[PDB]
Symmetry: C3
Subunit: 288 residues, 3 copies
Amino acid sequence: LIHPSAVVHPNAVIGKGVSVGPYCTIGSSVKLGNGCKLYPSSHVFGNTELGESCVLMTGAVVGDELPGYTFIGCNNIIGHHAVVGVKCQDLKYKHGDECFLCIGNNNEIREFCSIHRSSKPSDKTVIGDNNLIMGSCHIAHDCKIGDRNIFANNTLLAGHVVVEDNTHTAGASVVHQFCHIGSFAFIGGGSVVSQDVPKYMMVAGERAELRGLNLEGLRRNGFTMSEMKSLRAAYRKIFMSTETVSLSFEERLTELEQDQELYSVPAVSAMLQSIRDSFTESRRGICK
Amino acid sequence: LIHPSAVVHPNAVIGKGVSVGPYCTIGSSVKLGNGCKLYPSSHVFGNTELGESCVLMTGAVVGDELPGYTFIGCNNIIGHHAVVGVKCQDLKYKHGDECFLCIGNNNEIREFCSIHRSSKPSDKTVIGDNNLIMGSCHIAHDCKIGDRNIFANNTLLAGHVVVEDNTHTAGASVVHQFCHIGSFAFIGGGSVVSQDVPKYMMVAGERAELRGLNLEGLRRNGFTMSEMKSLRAAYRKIFMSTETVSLSFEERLTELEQDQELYSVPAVSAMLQSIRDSFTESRRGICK
Amino acid sequence: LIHPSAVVHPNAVIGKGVSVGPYCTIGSSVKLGNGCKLYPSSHVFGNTELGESCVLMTGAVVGDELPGYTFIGCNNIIGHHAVVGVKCQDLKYKHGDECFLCIGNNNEIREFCSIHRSSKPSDKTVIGDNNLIMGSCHIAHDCKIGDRNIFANNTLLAGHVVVEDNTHTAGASVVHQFCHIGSFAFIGGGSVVSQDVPKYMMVAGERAELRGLNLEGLRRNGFTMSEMKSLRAAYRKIFMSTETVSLSFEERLTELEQDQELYSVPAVSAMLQSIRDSFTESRRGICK
C-alpha cells in the first residue's frame, strides 16, 4: 500500500503488507520486512534493513549513504524526526570508511533521537532488545547498549559508552566517553557521569557521585529480601568501612571475596566483578 | 490556497483563507480555523482542531491517530519540526486508550518541542494562553500549564508537572514528575527541580535549592514597593528564623498567619497558601 | 539534477552541478553556489545565499521569509532537520524588523541544531570558519562565534554570547547571555556558565567554576613547553596568591604587567588582556 507520491526505488526490497505514506523516500538498497509501516514523509537511505513490523513516524530518517550498514530487528518504532544510522561526529572518522549500526527487537526510539554509526569499520554501534529511548536522546558512535533499558529525555551517551541491562537514566543525563553502566543501575536527573556506574548502583547530581544501591529498581525486578540484604552488607563493607584499612580500596574488595557468607550470593559476586572490571586496562574507575 | 502537491483529505474541515504549502498532509478528521497557514511539509493527523490564524512551520506535526483529541486555540505558532499532541512515554499507558491535549490561545511553541497527550482517558495535558515555549522543550503527559509562562530552550517538564502563571525557566531546567511551580517563579539554568517551587520564589543550581524571592520578576510584573517588602519579611519569618522554634516548619507558618500585619497582605496570604499546598496529600514538599 | 517532484521557484539562482532531491522546496530569492546538494525534503526560504558545495541533509531548513538575510559560505554541511537562519526568540524583537545571520566556510552543523537570526537590524548572528557544531545545539540571536570551535551535543549559547577560536564545549553546556568564551577554552560537561571564561582556561560543574588552564588543549594546539610554563606561573600569580594583597584582584593583575619576565611572553599578555576585558563596560566578570 504505497502512496503514488512516494519515491520508492525499483530495487528496494519491500515485504508483504508494507504501507508507505505520501512523500516518503526509500533507497535502492533498503530491505523492509513484512508489515513495516512508513508514515508520511519518512525516509530510508543506504544499505539498510528493517525487520518485520517496524514503524517510522513522520520525518523519521533511517540509514545514510555512507558505506557499511544500518541493521534493525523486528517491531521497532522510530519516532517523529528521529535520525537513526547516520555518520558519527568523531573527528577521527576517516572519509570513505565503512561504519555500522545494529539494533535488536522491540525497541522504542522516540522523537528527535540521534543514533550514530560506528567510528571505524572494525567496530559497531549496538542496541539490544526492548529498550525505551525517550525524546532527544543521543547515542554516539560505538556505544554498546543491552536490553530492557530506559533512557529519559535528553540522555546523552558519548562515544564508546557501554550500557548493560535494565538500567534507567533520568532526564538530561550526560555520560562521558568510555564509561560503563552496569545492569539495574540508576542515574539521577542532570547527572554528569564521568566514571563507571557499577551493577545495581545509583549515581546522582552535578558531576555525579555514587549514592548507594538502586533499591527501588532491585525491588521492582524481583530481587529477594535476603538478596538485597546481602548486597547492602557488601556495599557497606566496600564503601563505608570508615575505621579499618586506611588508603586501600583493593584490600576491602579482597576481604569481600574471602567473606564466604556474602560472596557465595550470586548478586554479590556479580557486583564485586562489576567493580573490578572498572580498574582493568583502559577502564575509567568508578564514580566517587 | 492549497498547493496541488499537498494531500488534503476530502473530509478535513478547512476554514476560509487557509493556506497549505507543498507536501503537507492533512487528515480526514482535522478542522482548521479561518486564516490558518501550513508551511511546506507540515502535517496534521488524527482528531485535531486548530483555532483561527494558527501557523505550522516546516516539518511541524500536530496530532496523531491515537483515540482522543488534540484541541488547540487561536493564533498559535508551531515551530519547525515541533511535535505536538503525540502518544505519551508513560509505560503505564494502555494500548487503545483515549488520550488528550488541550492548548489555549496566543502561544508560541518553538522548533523541536514535543508536547505529549495524556496517559489516561480521564486526564489531559493542558497548556493555557500566551506562553512562550522555546526550542527543544519537552512537556510530558498530564502536565497542567497556565498562562504567560516562558520556558527557555531544553526545559523538560516530566509527567503531571503543574505550572501556574508568569513563571520563567532558564535553559536546560529539569522538573521532576508531580512537581508544582507557583506563579511568578524563576528556575535558574540547568536546575534539577525535584520538589515544588512556591509562588514568587526562585530555585537554582544542581539538584536545585531555594534561593529567595524572584524579586526581578516581581518588580517587572507591577508588584508595589510595600508588597515586595511584606513578602520579603514573610520569607524571612518562614525560612530564616535561625534562633527560634527549633525543628518546626509548621509552627513558623502558623506564626505568619497570626501575624496580622503581614498576613492581611494578599500576596503574603497567597504565598503562605502556596507553601501549605505542597504538604497536602501526594504533593512533594518544597525545594530545600 | 533537480528531481521533478521538487518545488524550485523560477527565480531561485541555481549554480552549476547543483543537485536537488525529491520534495525539496527552494524559494524565489535563494542563491545556491555551484556543487550544492539538497537531500530529499530539505528546504531553503527567504533572502538566502549558500556558497559552493554546501550540503543540506533531509529535513534541513535554511532561511525564513523574515526581512534581512541568511548568508552562508562554502562547503558547509547542514545536518538532518537542522534549522538555520530563523526568527530569534528574543521578546524585544520587533515585528517586521530586518534580521541577519552570517556563517563562514567549512562548518559542520549537525542534526536538530537551531541557529537564530539577529534580534535587531543593526546586529547579526555570526559564525566563522571550520566549526563543528554537534547535534541539538542552540545558537541564539546575536552570538558571535569565531573559528575552529567544537560544541558538543546540546550546547546552548544564549543571546549575545561571544566565542573566540579553538574552544571546546562538552555535552549539555549552558552559556548565559552576554558571556564571553576566550580562545582555547574548555567548558566541562553540563556546565552552567554565567560569567566569562578567559583565554586558555577551563570551567566545569554545576553553576560552573574556573578550574585552571586548558593544558590538554594547549598541548594539542602546538603551545611550547615554556609557553605553558609561563602561563601556569601567571595563572598562579593571579588566582592563587593566598597570602599577599588581601581583597584586591586588580593589584595582582597590575603585579603581572610589571613582572617583565612573564608579561613579555605573548600568550601571558593575551591572557591578561582577556581577563581585563571581562571588567569593561557591560561585561559580566569571570567565573569564580
